[PDB]
Amino acid sequence: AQRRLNDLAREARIRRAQQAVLRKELIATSTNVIKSEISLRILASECHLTLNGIVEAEAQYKIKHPMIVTKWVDYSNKHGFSYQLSTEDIGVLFNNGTTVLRLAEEFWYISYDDREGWVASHYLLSEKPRELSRHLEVVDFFAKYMKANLSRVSTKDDVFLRRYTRYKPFVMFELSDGTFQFNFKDHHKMAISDGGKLVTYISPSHESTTYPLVEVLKYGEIPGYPESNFREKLTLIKEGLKQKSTIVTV
Amino acid sequence: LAQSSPA
Ligand SMILES: [Cl-]
């Protein structure tokens, strides 16, 4: 019959359906710019070390909660990027690269050096400089705006955000303590801490639990939530991590 | 302009 020509064409279709074309690669639509090669090397490194912990734990499956970003605003085109940590400190990444981190009293003023990566300067709000007066006006505006109509909350040093990157599927946060946090369009979140060994999961309804990664991989899924597509989400993390680990010049 | 989940 002509079913032979049909069955053969069918078979070739199934083979081709197992390969890719027009497949999405991670593209950053927004990220803070780092004007230091050394700063990038430190970032790239941290991505590699943390990735290694994932991969080591991936080939090897056969509880302290990390600091996280509770809310954020990418206003990069106007004022700058803002965020709030589980410590309820507020940071603002200014478009020049500098940062002001106001504690829960005082604030840190951060920027980077071509010879020393990141540089920080602690101040008292009492003793704030006149030159940094506009910065804290912007922080004050971000602090109040974020309180009013952004929603989330969390329950041994000062931590700031070195790098954020917004992809279509998720926004990725690189904190200064080596923690990585991923916010998915699924409204599911997870944070990778402690060299890649520990994984934290935050729910759409804001339930958060920290678990060893080996265990979670022993489960084959986060224990509470089956709706969370963990395998795919851990794959995106890995793709995101690897991409950054090679960004060492700009 | 983008942001996290609203209140
Ligand atoms: Cl930007």
Residue numbers in the entry:
A (entry chain A): 435 to 496, 508 to 549, 552 to 602, 610 to 704
B (entry chain C): 228 to 234
Q: What do the authors of the reporting publication say about this deposited model?
A:
To confirm how Cdc5 recognizes phosphorylated substrates, we then solved the structure of Cdc5 bound to a phosphorylated peptide derived from the spindle-pole body protein Spc72 (Spc72P, 227SLAQSpSPAGSQ237). As expected, the Spc72P phosphopeptide bound along the groove determined by the two polo-boxes and adopts an extended conformation that runs antiparallel to β1, effectively extending the β-sheet of the first polo-box by one strand. The strictly conserved His641 and Lys643 cradle the phosphate group, confirming that Cdc5 recognizes phosphorylated substrates the same way as other Plk1 homologs. As expected, the Spc72 peptide bound to the groove at the interface of the two polo boxes. Using isothermal calorimetry, we confirmed that the Spc72P peptide interacted with the polo-box domain of Cdc5, and the interaction was phosphorylation dependent. We found that Spc72P bound to Cdc5 and Cdc5-Dbf4 with similar affinities. In vitro, Dbf4 and phosphorylated peptides can bind simultaneously and not competitively to the polo-box domain of Cdc5.
